[PDB]
Symmetry: D3
Subunit: 163 residues, 6 copies
C-alpha cells in the first residue's frame, strides 16, 4: 500500500563488511533503507558520530536507496518519526537472538506498530563484529579483510593519535 522503509540501527563503530553485506541484501528487498547510527550514549565509542557516519556513507553510498542518519533517543520513537515499516537487525549468534527477541517484544509494548525483521550473515562474514574488529586493530592486527578501505585508514589515523 505504501512503499517500505526499513531502519538498520547500530553504533557502527566502525562499519564492517558484515554491515555492508546486510545493508546490500536489505536494499534489494525494501524500497528505502536507513542506516541509523546511534550516538551511543555510554558504551563510549572509539570513532565520533561524524566519523562513523562518514565511514558508513563512503562504504555504502553506491547503493542509491540507502540513507545515513545519526540518532539519539529511543529506537521506538525514531521508528515512529521515520514512519518506518520495520527495524532490521543481523543475528550472528545465540546471544544476539535472545537480546533482539526481548527488544522486539519490549518495543512492540511501547508501540504496537513496531516491527523487527532479522537477517543472518553470509557465511564469510559470520564472525565479524565491530567489537572484535576493534580488539584486533587495537593489538595492531590487520583488519583489511573484514572492513572497507576507509575503515582501515581510520584505524591507522587512530593509532597515530595514540590509540
Amino acid at each position: 500500500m505504501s512503499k517500505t522503509r526499513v531502519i538498520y540501527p547500530g553504533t557502527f563503530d566502525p562499519i564492517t563488511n558484515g554491515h555492508v553485506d546486510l545493508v546490500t541484501r536489505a536494499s534489494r528487498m525494501f524500497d528505502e533503507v536507513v542506516v541509523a547510527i546511534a550516538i551511543g550514549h555510554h558504551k563510549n565509542p572509539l570513532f565520533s558520530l561524524e566519523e562513523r557516519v562518514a565511514l558508513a556513507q563512503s562504504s555504502l553510498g553506491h547503493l542509491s536507496n540507502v540513507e545515513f542518519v545519526g540518532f539519539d533517543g529511543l529506537l521506538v520513537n525514531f521508528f515512529k518519526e521515520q514512519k518506518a515499516t520495520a527495524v532490521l537487525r543481523g543475528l550472528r549468534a545465540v546471544s544476539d537472538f535472545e537480546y533482539e527477541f526481548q527488544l522486539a517484544n519490549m518495543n512492540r509494548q511501547l508501540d504496537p506498530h513496531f516491527e523487527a525483521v532479522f537477517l543472518t550473515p553470509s557465511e564469510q562474514y559470520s564472525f565479524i563484529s565491530s567489537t572484535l574488529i576493534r580488539e584486533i586493530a587495537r593489538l595492531k592486527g590487520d583488519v583489511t579483510k573484514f572492513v572497507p578501505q576507509a575503515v582501515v585508514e581510520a584505524f591507522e589515523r587512530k593509532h597515530q593519535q595514540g590509540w
Copy 2:
C-alpha cells in the same frame, strides 16, 4: 523488478495462532505472501495436506495478498519457481535459530539469490507450536485459546474418527 513476494513454508500441522500472527505481520510488509504447506513426506503429519491447506485458507483468507500452496519440501526449487524475493521463518527458540541459520547458508550455496528473513513471535504466541498443540489435543486438552476455530473443529473430527 521490485514488488516483493515472500514464501512462508511449514507443515502447518495444524496452523496455530502463532502462524496467523506471523503471516499477518508479514502481509503488512511484503506485496505478496505465499503460505507454502510442505506435504511433509519424511514426517507423517496428523492432518492431510488438503486438510492443512483448508485450515490455512480459512484462518488467513481474509488477507487479500496471501496465497496458499502445497509443495514438496524442496525449498530452494520452490523459491526459484515462485520467483520469490525471500523466505520467511519465525524463530521461537534458540534451536530454531541455529537450524535456520544453517539452512539459510545451505540454500544460499544452492542459489546465490536465495534470501531468508526472520521474525520473532510476540510474547503471547511464543509458547505455541503445532507439535505441542497436537499433543495437548490428543490427550483431550482444550486448545481453543491457541488455534483458530476451524482447527478446534478439525481436532474434534479427528477424535470422532481415529485418534
Copy 3:
C-alpha cells in the same frame, strides 16, 4: 503467606515427573534435594506413551521406591495423560524439573508457559544438577548397560540388579 503455618493447607506438594527408565543417581540427588525444601514430593512416573520404555511402569515404580523409600515425605505414582491435569488432581503446589542442558531449559521454559495458560495456578520450579551427576541420563545409562558396560557408579544397586535380570531375559 496468610494461611497459618500450622495448617495442612500451608504445606507444599511438588510433582517430579519423568519416565525414570530407569531411575539414576541424578534423579535420586534431585529428589533428595527437593525433599528438604517441600513438605511432599511425588515421584510421578509417566507410563511413557511413545518412546516405549525398557522397564515396565511397575518395575520403574519399584526401582524408585527402593532407591528413595528412605525419604519419608516421598511418594511414587504412575500417571498417564496431561501433566497439567495430573497437577490439578494431585493438588500440587508446583512441578519440579531438573535442567541438565540448554535444550532442557528451552523446552521447559515453553512448557511452563503453555501449562500456565492451561491452568493459571500451574507453577514450575527448576533445579540444576550437581556436577558429579550432570553427565548422567537414563538414556545414556540404558545404552551403556545394553552394551554390558558397568553402570554401577551411576545408579542405585537395585537398578544394577534390574539390568542384570534384563540381560538374563535377553534384554
Copy 4:
C-alpha cells in the same frame, strides 16, 4: 517443624514488574522470602541502596511473608547467616541459565548446604529487565507498564535532578 526461608538476591536497580511477579510466586511456595538487595559491587547502580530498598518495600510490602535487606559480600556467606533453605533466581535467557548453573555448583563447593532454585518468567514479563527499563526511562520513554508506581515516581525525581 522446619520453615523454609528463601533468599532472592539481585541489584534491583530498579525493581520491575518481573521481580514482583517472581517474588509473588515464590511467596506462595516458601514460608519466608528475603528480597536481598546487593549493594552492587561496581557496575554502580543508578539508584542508591536506600532508594532500591525503599522501592522494593513499597512494591512488595503487601506480601506479609516477604522481608527486605541490603547486603554486600559473598552470597554464600549471606546464605549461611540468614539460615536460608535456598537461593531463588529467575532465568530469563540461556546466558542466565548457564551462569546460574555454574554459580550453583561453585556455591555448593563453598558450602555443601547451598541450594539454588529457579523460576522462569511468565511471558508477559519475559522481556522486562532493569537494564532495559533504565535505558528507556533515561531517554524519557514511558515505563509505567513495566514497573510499579513508586518506580515511575523515582525516575521522575531522577530527571528533576538531571539524572
Copy 5:
C-alpha cells in the same frame, strides 16, 4: 621423562567415530585436518545398531575409502559396541568429534564426561567445521537427496553416484 620422538610409542592415534550415512564434505574436511595433526586417524563407522541406516556398513566403508583414501595415514573400519571399549582396543590417544552447533557441544561435553567415568584414559578432542561446511550433516543430505534435490555441492562424487543407485532401487 618422555618417550623419544623416534619411538612408535610417541605416535598418536585418533578415532573419528560416526555412522557416516553417507560421508559428506564436512567429514572430509575434518579428517583432512585431523590427518595433519595426528599420526594415525581411524574413520570408525558405527554399524548403527537399529538406527536403520540408508547405506550398508560395507557401502559406507567403501564411500569413506574412496573419499579419503588419498590420505595415507587414514584407516577405515566398521565397529559396533561401546565407543569406550573400541577406544581401548584400538589403543587410541583420543576420539575426535566435530562440533557444528550448540546441541552438538552439549551432547559431546556430556559424552566425554561419561566416557571418562567409564575409562579414565578416555580423551575427546573437538574441531569446528570450516565455514563453508558448517551446515552439512548426513541427515540433512539424506533428506535433500530423498526429495531428489541435488547434493553434489556437499558430498564427494562417489556419494552422488551411490544416491543415484539408491533412487534406481526405489528410494
Copy 6:
C-alpha cells in the same frame, strides 16, 4: 610426521585447577605445549604478566614438555612465529563455544594454516573460571579447592597489600 606444538593462550589471571587439567591432558597428546599468557593490557589484569607466568610455571613445571611465555595477544601472529600446529582452547559453556567457533573462522581467514582444537573440561572443573575465582577471593572466600597452592599465596599477597 613432524612434531606437534600446540599453543594454549589465555590471560591466566590467575591460573586455576581448570587450566592445569587442560594443560595436563594436552601434554599427553602433543609433543610440545606452550602456555601463552596474553599480557592483556586492556581489561587490565589483577596479576602482573610476570606473576602470572611464574604462577603457571610453578603449577605446571612438573610437565617436562610444557613451556611458559608471555605474548601480546595477537594470536594468529604468535601462531605463525611459534610454528604451531594448533591452538588449544577449553570450552566450558555455550558462550565459549560460540565465541571460539567465530574466532577460529576469523583466524583461519587470516592464515589458512591456522588450526584450533578444543577440549571440554572434566566435570569437577567445569564451574571454575579465573573471573569467578578472583571475585570469590576478593570477598575473602576460600579458593583453596579451585587453584594451586601458589595461587592461594598470591591472593594472600594481594590481601596483605589491601585488596
